[PDB]
């Protein structure tokens, strides 16, 4: 699944 943590 797409994961976005910045």
């Amino acid at each position, epitope marked *: 699944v*797409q994961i*976005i*943590y*910045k």
Partner: antibody
Amino acid sequence: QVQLQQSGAALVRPGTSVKVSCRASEYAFTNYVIEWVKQRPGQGLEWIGVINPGSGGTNYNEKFKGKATLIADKSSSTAYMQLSSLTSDDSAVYFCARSTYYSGALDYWGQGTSVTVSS
Amino acid sequence: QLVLTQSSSASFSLGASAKLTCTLSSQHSTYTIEWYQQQPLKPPKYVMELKKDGSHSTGDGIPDRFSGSSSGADRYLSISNIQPEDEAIYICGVGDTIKEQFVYVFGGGTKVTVLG
């Protein structure tokens, strides 16, 4: 107006290093990140990386490790991108852009800073 | 692995309907992408966020003639009643957290010309 104010045009010599500035105004600087994008004249967009002002945490496109350094100053609401070991390859418009911690969208962009590497 | 494939730079009549295609790498078929619009000499502008189910959110200053839809790995930008100010390159972007590092990638962009 949520605004990102970038430093002005730069004409620099090969082998030097330049520092572009991105000043945030009229938005909570530490509730968002700053991403940087490279555009070579008449070429597409190339993602450089992201600074999280709030954490200091950085993420970089592999191609730019040792090339680009991203730093943030909370007190001045300012993000900086330094470019090292400059060549003609590094000649481009550099954009700063606002994005969220958890989403893709570069929802607002700076005007661009034209870095020319020339003798 | 994370790749965006943009459809051919095209030419649409003033007031006609345009559909651009951004196709995701097959394993990333569920991913949300962003559309961007770059007019001459101007910084790119955020156009919308577009999810696997066709649900979208348009950015600051984007007219209601820009919408989106999805079909498998295809992420589409629809412009109805295309206007001269819509003339630009349209660029898709996608993020993921790979090798434990965040990465953003751009499509190569589609040059939208408005004829007439």
